[PDB]
JSON list of C-alpha atoms in Angstrom, two decimals:
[
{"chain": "A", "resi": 1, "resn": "UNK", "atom": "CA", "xyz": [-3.93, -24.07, 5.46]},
{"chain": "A", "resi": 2, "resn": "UNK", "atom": "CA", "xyz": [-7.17, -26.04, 5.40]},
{"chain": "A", "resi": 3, "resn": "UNK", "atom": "CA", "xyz": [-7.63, -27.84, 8.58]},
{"chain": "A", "resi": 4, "resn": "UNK", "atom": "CA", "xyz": [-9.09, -31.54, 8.72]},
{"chain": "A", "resi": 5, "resn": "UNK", "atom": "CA", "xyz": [-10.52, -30.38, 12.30]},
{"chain": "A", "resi": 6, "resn": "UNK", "atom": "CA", "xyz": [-12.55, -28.10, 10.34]},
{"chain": "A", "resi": 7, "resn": "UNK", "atom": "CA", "xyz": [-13.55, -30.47, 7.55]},
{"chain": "A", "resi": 8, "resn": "UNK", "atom": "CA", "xyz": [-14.47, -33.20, 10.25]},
{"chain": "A", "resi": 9, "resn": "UNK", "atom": "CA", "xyz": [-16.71, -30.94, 12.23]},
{"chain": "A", "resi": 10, "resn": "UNK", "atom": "CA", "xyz": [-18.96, -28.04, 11.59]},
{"chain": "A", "resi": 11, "resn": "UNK", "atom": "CA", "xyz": [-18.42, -24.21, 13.07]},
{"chain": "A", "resi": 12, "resn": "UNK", "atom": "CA", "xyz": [-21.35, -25.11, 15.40]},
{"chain": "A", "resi": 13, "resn": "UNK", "atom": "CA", "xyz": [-19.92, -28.10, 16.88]},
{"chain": "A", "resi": 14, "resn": "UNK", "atom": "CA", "xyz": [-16.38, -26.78, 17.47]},
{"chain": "A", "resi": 15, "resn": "UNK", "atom": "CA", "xyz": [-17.90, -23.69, 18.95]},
{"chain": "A", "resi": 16, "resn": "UNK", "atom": "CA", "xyz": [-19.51, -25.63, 21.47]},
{"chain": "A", "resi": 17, "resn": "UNK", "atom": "CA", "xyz": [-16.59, -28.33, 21.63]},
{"chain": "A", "resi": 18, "resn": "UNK", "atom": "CA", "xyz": [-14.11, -25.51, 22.66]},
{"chain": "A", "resi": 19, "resn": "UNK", "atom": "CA", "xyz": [-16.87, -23.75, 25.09]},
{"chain": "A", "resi": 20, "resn": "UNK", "atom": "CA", "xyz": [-17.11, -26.81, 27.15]},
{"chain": "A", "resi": 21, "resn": "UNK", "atom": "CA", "xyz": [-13.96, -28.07, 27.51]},
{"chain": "A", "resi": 22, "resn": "UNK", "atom": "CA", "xyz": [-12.38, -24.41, 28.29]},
{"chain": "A", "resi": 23, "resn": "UNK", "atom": "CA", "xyz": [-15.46, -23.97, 30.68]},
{"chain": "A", "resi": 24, "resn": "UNK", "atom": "CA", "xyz": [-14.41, -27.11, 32.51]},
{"chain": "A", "resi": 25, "resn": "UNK", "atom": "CA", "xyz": [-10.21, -26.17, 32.57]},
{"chain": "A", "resi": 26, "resn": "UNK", "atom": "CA", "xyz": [-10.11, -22.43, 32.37]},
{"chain": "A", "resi": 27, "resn": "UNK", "atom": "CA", "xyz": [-6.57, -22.78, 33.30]},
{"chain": "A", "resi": 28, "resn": "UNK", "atom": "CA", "xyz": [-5.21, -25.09, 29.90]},
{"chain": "A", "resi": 29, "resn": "UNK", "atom": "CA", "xyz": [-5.47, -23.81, 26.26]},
{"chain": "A", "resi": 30, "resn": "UNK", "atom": "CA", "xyz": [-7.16, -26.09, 23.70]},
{"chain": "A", "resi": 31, "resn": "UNK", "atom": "CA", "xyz": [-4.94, -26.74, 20.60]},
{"chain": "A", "resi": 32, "resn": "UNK", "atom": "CA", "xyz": [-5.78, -28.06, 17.81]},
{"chain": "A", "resi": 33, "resn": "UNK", "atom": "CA", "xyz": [-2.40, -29.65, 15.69]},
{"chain": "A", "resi": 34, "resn": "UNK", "atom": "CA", "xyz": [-2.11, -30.56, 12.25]},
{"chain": "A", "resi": 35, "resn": "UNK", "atom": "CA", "xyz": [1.09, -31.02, 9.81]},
{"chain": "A", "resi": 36, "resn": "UNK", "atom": "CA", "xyz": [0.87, -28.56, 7.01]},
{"chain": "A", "resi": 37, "resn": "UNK", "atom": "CA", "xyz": [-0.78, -30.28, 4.14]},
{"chain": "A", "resi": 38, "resn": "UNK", "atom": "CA", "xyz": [1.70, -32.04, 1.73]},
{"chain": "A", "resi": 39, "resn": "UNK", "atom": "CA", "xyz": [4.80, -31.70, 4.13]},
{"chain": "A", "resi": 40, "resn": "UNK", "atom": "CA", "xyz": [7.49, -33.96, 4.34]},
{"chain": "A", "resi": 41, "resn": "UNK", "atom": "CA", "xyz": [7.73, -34.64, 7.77]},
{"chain": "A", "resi": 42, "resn": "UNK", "atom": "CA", "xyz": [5.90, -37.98, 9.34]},
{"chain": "A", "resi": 43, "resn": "UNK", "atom": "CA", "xyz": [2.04, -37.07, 10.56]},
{"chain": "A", "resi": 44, "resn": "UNK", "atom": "CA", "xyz": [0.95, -36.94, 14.31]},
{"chain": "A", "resi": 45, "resn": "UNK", "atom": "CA", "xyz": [-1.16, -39.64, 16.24]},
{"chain": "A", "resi": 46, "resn": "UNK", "atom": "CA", "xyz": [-2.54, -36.67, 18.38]},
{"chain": "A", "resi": 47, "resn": "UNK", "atom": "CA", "xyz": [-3.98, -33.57, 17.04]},
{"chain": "A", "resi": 48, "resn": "UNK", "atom": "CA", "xyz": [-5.52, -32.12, 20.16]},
{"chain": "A", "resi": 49, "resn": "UNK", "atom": "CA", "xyz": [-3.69, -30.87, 22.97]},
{"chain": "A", "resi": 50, "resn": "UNK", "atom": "CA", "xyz": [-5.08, -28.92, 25.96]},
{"chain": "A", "resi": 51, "resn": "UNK", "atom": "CA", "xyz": [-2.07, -27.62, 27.99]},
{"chain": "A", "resi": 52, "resn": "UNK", "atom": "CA", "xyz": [-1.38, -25.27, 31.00]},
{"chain": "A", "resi": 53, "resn": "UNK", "atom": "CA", "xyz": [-1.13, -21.72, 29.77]},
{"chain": "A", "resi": 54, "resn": "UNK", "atom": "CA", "xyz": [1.95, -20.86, 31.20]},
{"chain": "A", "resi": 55, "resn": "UNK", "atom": "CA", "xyz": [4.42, -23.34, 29.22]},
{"chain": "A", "resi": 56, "resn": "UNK", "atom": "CA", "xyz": [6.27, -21.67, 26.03]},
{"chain": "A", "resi": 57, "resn": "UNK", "atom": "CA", "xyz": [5.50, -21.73, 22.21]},
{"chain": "A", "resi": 58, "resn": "UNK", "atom": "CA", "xyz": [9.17, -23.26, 22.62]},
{"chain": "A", "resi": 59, "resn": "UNK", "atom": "CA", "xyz": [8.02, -26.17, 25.47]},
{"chain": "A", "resi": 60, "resn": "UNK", "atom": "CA", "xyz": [4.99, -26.39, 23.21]},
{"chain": "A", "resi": 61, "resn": "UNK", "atom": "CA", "xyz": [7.09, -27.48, 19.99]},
{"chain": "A", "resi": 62, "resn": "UNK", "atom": "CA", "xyz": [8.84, -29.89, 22.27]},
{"chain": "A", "resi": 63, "resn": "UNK", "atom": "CA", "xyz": [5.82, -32.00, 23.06]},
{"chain": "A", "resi": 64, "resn": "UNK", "atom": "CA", "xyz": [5.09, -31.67, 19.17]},
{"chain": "A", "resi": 65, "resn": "UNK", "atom": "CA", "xyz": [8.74, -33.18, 18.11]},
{"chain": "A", "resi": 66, "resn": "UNK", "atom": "CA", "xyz": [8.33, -35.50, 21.51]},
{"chain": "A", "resi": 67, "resn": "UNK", "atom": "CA", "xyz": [5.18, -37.02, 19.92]},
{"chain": "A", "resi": 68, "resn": "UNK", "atom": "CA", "xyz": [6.51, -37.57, 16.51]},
{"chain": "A", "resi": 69, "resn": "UNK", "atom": "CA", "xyz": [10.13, -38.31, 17.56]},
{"chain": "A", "resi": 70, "resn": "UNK", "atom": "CA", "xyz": [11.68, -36.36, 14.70]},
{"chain": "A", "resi": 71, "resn": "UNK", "atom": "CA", "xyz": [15.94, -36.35, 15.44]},
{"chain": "A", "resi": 72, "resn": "UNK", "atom": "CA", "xyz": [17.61, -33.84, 17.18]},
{"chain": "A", "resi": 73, "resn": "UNK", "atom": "CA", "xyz": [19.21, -33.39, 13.55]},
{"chain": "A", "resi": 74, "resn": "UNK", "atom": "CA", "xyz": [16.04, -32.21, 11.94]},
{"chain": "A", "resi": 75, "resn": "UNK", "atom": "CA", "xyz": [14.03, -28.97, 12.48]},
{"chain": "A", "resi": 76, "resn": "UNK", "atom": "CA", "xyz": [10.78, -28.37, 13.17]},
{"chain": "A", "resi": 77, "resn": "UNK", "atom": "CA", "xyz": [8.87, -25.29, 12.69]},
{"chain": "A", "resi": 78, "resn": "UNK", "atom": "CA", "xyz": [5.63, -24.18, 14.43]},
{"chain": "A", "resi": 79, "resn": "UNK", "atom": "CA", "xyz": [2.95, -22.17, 12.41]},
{"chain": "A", "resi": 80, "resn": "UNK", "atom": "CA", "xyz": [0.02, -20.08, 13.42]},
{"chain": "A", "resi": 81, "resn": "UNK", "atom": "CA", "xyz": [-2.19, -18.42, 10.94]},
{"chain": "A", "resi": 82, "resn": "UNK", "atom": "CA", "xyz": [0.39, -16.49, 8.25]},
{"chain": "A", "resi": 83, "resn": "UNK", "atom": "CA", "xyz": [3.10, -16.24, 10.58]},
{"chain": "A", "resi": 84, "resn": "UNK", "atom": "CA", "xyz": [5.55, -18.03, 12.91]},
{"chain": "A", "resi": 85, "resn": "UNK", "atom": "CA", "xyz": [4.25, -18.03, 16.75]},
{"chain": "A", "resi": 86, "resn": "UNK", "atom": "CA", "xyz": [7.31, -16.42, 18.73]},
{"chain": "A", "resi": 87, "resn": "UNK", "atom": "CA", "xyz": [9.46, -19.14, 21.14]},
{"chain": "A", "resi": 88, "resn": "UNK", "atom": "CA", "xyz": [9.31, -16.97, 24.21]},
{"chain": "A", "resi": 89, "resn": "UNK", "atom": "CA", "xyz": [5.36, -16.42, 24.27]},
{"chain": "A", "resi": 90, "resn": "UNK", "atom": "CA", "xyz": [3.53, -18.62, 26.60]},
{"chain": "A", "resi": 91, "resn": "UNK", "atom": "CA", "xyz": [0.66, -20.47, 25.23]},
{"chain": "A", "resi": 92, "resn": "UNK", "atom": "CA", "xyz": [-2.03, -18.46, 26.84]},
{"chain": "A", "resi": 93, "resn": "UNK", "atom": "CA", "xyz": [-0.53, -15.63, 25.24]},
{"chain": "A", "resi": 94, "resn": "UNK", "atom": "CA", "xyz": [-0.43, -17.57, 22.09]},
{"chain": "A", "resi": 95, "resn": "UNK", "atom": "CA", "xyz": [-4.11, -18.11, 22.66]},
{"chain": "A", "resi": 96, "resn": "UNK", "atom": "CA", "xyz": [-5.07, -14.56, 23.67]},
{"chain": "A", "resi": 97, "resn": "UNK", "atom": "CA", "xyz": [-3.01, -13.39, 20.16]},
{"chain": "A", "resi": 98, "resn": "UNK", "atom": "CA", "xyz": [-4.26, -15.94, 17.71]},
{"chain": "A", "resi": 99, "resn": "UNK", "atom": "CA", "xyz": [-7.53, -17.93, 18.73]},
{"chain": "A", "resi": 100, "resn": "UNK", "atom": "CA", "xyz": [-9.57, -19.35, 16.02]},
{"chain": "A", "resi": 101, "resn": "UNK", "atom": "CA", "xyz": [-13.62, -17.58, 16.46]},
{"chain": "A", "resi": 102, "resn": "UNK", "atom": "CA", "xyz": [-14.58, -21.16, 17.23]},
{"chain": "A", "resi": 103, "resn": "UNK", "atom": "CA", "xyz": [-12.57, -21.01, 20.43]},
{"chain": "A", "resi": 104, "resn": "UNK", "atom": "CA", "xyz": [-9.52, -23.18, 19.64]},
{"chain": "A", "resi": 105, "resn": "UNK", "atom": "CA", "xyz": [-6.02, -22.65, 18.94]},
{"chain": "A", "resi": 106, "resn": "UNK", "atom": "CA", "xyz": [-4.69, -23.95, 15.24]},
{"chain": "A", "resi": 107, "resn": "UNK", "atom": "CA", "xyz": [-1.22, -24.54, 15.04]},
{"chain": "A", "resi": 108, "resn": "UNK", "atom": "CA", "xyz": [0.48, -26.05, 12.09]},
{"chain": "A", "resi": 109, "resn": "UNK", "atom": "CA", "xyz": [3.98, -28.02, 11.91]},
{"chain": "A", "resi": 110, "resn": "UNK", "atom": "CA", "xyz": [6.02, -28.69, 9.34]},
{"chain": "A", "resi": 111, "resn": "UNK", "atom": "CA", "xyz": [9.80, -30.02, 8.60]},
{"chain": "A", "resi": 112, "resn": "UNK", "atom": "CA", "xyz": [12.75, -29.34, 5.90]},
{"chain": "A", "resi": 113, "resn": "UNK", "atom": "CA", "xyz": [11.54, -27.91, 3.10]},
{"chain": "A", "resi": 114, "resn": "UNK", "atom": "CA", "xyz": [14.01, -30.44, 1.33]},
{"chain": "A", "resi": 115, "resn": "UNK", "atom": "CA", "xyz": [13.85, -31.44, -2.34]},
{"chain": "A", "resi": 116, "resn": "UNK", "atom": "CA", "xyz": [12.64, -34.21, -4.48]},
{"chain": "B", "resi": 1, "resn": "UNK", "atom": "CA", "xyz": [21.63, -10.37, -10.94]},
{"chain": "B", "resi": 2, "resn": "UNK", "atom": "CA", "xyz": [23.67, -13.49, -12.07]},
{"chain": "B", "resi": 3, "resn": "UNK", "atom": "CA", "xyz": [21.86, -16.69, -10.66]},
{"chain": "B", "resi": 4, "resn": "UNK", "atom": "CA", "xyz": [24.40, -19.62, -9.78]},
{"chain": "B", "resi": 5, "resn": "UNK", "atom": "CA", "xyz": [21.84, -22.38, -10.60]},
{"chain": "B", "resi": 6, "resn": "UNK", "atom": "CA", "xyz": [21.23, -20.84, -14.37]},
{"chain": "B", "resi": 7, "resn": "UNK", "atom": "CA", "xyz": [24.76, -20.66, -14.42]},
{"chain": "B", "resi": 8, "resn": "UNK", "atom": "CA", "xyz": [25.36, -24.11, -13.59]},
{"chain": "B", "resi": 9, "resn": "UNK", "atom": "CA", "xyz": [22.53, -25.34, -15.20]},
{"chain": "B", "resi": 10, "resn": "UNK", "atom": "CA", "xyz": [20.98, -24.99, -18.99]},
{"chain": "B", "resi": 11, "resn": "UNK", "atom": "CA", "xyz": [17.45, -23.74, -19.39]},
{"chain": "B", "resi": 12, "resn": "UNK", "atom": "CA", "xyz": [16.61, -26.84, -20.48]},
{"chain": "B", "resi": 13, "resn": "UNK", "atom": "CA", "xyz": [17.51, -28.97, -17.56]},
{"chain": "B", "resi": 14, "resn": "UNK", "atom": "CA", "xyz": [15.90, -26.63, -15.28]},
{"chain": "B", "resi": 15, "resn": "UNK", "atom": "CA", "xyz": [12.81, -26.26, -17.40]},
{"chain": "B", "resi": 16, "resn": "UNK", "atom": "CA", "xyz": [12.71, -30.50, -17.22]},
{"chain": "B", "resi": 17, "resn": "UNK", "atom": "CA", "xyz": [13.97, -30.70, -13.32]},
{"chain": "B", "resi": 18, "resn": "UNK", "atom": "CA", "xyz": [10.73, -28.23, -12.43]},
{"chain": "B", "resi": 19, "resn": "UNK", "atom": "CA", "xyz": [8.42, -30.26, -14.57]},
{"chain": "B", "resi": 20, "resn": "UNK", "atom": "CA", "xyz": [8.84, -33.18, -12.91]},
{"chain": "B", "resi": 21, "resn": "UNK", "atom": "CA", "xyz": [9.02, -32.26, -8.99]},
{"chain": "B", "resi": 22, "resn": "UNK", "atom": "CA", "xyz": [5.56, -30.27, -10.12]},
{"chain": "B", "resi": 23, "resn": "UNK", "atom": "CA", "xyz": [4.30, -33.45, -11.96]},
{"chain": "B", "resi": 24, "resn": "UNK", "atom": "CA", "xyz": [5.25, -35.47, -8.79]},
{"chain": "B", "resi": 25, "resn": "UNK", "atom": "CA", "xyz": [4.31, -33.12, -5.86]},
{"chain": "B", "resi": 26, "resn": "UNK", "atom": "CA", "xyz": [1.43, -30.87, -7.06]},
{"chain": "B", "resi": 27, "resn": "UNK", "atom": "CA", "xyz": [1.13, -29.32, -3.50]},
{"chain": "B", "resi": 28, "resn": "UNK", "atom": "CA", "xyz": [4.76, -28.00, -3.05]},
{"chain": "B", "resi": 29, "resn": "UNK", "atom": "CA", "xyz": [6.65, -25.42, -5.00]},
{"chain": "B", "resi": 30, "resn": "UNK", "atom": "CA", "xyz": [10.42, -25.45, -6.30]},
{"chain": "B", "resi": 31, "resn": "UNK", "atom": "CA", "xyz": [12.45, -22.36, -4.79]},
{"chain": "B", "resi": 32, "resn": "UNK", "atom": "CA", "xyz": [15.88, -20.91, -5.42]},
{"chain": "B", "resi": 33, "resn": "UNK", "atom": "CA", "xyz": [17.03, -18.75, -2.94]},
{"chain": "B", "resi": 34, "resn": "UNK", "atom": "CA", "xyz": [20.71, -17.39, -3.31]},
{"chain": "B", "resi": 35, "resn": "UNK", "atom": "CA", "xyz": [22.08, -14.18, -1.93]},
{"chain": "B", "resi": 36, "resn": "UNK", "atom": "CA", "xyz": [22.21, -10.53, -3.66]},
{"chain": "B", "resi": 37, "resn": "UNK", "atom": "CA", "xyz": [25.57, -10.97, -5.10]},
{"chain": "B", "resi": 38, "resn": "UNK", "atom": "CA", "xyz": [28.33, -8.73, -4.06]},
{"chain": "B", "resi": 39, "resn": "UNK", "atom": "CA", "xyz": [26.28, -8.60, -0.64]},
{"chain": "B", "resi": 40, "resn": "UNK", "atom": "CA", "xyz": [27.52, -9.00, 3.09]},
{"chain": "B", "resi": 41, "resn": "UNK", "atom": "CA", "xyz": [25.08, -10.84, 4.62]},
{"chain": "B", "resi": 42, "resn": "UNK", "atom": "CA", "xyz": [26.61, -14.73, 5.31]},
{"chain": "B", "resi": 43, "resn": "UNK", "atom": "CA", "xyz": [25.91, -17.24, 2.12]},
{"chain": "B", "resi": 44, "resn": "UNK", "atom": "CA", "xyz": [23.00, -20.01, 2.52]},
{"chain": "B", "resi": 45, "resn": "UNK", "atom": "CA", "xyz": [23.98, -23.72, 2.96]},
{"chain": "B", "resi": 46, "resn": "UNK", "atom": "CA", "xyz": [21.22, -24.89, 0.78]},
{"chain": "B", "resi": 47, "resn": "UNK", "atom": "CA", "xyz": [19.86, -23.24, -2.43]},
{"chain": "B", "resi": 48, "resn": "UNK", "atom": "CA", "xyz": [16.80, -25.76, -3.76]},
{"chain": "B", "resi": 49, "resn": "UNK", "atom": "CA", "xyz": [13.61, -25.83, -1.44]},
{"chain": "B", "resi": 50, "resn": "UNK", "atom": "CA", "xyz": [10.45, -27.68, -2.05]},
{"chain": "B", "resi": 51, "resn": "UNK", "atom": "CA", "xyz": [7.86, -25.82, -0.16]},
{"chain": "B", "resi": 52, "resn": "UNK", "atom": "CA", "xyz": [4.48, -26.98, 0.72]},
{"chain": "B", "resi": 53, "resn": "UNK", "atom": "CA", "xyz": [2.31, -23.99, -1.33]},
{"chain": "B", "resi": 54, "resn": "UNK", "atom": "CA", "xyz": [0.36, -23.24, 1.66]},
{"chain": "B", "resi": 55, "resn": "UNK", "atom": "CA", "xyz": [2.48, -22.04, 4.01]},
{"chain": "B", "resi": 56, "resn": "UNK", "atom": "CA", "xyz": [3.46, -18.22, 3.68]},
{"chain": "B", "resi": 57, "resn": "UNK", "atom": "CA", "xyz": [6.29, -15.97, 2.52]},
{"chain": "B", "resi": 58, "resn": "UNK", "atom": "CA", "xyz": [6.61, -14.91, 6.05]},
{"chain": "B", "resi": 59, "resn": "UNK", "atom": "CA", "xyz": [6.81, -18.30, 7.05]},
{"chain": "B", "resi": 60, "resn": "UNK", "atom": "CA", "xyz": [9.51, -18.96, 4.54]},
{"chain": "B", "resi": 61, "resn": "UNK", "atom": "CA", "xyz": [11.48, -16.11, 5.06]},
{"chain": "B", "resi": 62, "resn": "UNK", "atom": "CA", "xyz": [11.76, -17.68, 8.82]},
{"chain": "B", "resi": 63, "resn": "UNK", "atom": "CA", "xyz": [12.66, -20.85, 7.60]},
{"chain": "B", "resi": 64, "resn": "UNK", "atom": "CA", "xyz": [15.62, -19.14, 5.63]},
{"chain": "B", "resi": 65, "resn": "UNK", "atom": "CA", "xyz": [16.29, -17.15, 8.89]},
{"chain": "B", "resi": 66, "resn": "UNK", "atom": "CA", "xyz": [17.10, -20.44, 10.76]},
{"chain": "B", "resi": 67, "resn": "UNK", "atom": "CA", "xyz": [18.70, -21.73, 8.21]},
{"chain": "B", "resi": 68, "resn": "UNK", "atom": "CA", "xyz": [21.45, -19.19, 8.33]},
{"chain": "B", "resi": 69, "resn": "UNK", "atom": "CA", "xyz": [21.01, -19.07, 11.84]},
{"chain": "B", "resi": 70, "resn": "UNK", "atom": "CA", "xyz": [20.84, -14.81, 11.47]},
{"chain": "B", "resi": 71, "resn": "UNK", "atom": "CA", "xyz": [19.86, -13.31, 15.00]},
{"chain": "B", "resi": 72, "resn": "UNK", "atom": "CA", "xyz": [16.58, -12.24, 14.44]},
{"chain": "B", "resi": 73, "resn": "UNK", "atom": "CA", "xyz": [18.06, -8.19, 15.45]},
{"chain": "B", "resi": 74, "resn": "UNK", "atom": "CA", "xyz": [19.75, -8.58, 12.09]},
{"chain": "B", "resi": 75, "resn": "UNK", "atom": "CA", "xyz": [17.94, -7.75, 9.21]},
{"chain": "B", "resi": 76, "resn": "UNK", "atom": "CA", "xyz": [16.84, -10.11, 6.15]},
{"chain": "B", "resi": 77, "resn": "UNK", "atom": "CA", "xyz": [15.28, -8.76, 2.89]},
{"chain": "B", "resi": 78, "resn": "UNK", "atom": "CA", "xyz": [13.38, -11.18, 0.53]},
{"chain": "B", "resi": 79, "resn": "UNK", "atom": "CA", "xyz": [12.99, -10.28, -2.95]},
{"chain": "B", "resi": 80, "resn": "UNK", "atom": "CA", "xyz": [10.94, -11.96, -6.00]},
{"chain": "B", "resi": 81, "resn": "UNK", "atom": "CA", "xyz": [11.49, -10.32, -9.15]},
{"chain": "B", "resi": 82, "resn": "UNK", "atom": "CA", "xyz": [13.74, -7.39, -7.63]},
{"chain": "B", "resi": 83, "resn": "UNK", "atom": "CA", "xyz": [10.87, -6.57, -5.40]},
{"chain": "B", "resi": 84, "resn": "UNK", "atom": "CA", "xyz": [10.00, -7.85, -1.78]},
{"chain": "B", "resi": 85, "resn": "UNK", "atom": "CA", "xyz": [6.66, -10.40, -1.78]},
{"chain": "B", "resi": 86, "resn": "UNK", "atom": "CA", "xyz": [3.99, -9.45, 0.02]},
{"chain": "B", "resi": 87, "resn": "UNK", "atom": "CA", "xyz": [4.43, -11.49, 3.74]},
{"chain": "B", "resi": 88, "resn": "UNK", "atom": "CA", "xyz": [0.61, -12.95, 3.70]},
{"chain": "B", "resi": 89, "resn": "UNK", "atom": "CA", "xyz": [0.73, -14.36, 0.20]},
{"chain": "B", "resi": 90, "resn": "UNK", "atom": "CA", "xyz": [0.77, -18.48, 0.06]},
{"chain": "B", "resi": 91, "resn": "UNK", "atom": "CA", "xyz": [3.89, -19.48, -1.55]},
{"chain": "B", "resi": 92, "resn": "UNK", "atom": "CA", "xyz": [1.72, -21.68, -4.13]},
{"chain": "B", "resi": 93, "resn": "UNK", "atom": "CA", "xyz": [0.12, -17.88, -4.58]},
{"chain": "B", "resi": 94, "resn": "UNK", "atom": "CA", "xyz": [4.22, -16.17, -5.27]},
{"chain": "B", "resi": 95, "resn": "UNK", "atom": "CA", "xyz": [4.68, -19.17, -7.16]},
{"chain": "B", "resi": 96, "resn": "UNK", "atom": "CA", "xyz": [1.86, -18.49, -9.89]},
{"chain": "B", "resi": 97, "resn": "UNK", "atom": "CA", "xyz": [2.68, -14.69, -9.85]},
{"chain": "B", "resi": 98, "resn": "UNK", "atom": "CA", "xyz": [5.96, -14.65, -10.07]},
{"chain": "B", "resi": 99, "resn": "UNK", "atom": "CA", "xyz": [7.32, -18.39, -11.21]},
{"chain": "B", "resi": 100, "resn": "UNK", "atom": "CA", "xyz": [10.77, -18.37, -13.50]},
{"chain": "B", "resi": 101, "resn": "UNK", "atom": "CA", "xyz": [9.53, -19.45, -16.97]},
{"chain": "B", "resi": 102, "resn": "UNK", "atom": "CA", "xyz": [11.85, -22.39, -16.16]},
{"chain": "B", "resi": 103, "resn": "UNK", "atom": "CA", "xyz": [9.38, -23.65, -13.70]},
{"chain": "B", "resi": 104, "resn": "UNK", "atom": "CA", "xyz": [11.50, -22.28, -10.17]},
{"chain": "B", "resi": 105, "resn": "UNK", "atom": "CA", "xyz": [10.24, -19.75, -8.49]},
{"chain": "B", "resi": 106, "resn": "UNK", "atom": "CA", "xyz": [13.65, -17.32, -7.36]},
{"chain": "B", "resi": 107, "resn": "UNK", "atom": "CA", "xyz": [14.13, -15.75, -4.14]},
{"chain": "B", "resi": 108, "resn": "UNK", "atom": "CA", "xyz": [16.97, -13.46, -3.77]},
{"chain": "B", "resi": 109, "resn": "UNK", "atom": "CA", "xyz": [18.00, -12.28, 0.36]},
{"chain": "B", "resi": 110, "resn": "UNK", "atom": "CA", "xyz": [20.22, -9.94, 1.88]},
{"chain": "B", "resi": 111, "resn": "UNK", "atom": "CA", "xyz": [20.89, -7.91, 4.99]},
{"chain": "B", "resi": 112, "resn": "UNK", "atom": "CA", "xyz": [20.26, -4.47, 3.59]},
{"chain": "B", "resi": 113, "resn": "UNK", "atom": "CA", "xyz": [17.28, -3.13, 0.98]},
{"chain": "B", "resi": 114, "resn": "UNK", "atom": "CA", "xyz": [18.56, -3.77, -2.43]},
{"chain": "B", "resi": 115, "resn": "UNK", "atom": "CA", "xyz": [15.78, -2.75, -4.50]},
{"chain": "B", "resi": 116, "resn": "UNK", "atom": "CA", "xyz": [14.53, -0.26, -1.44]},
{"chain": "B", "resi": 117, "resn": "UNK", "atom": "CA", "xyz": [15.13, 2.86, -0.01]}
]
């Protein structure tokens, strides 16, 4: 995926970004969250999250489908690099297994991959 | 194998369907996925996806996973061309490598190795 994060701001500055505010909460885990491009589902008014390390990839999907109010009805699925991040880790697990070199955590969301 | 969509539809109307969900979404790619026929593994609610190209076959294969609901202790086998997909490709990457000439790209599944030891 090609993040906007990444097209918005340059290595350098999300290097630093991250080193600051993780400095500053050692305790949370800065995530950066973006729908996969050309998805379906409805986009998301907030893209970074910094959240205590010890809720699940599973509690962690909830504030995603919270904050876009997608139905009961519909899934959502959570994406990190190539793979899908499993429910039962806990973020800073997530974080220790996956970090971006700039510091941050990318995770991607996406819907149904329904028809035309 | 014997594909239930080419059975139920001509080459034609495939070849036209593809053309214009490609026209119309340049960034997602049109995928069959039935099940080896003749295997044991439960059948799939839904056969046509529309996949974003940049997510993965891995992630894919998940999203087939849930939608058969299939404990993640049972096994699932994905295969393109009677061979499995490498897990990292993009599935706008599968797509150009191994795309139906029809325009769909076909992915069979099962619970055992078909085309495997």
């Amino acid at each position: 995926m090609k993040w906007m994060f990444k097209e918005d701001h340059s290595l350098e500055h999300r290097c630093v970004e991250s080193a600051k505010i993780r400095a500053k909460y050692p305790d949370r885990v800065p995530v950066i969250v973006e729908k996969v491009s050309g998805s379906q589902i409805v986009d998301i008014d907030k893209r970074k999250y910094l959240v205590p390390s010890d809720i699940t990839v599973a509690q962690f999907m909830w504030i995603i489908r919270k904050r876009i109010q997608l139905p009961s009805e519909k899934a959502i699925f959570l994406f990190v690099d190539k793979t899908v991040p499993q429910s039962s880790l806990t973020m800073g697990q997530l974080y220790e297994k996956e970090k971006d070199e700039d510091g941050f955590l990318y995770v991607a969301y996406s819907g149904e991959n329904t028809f035309g």
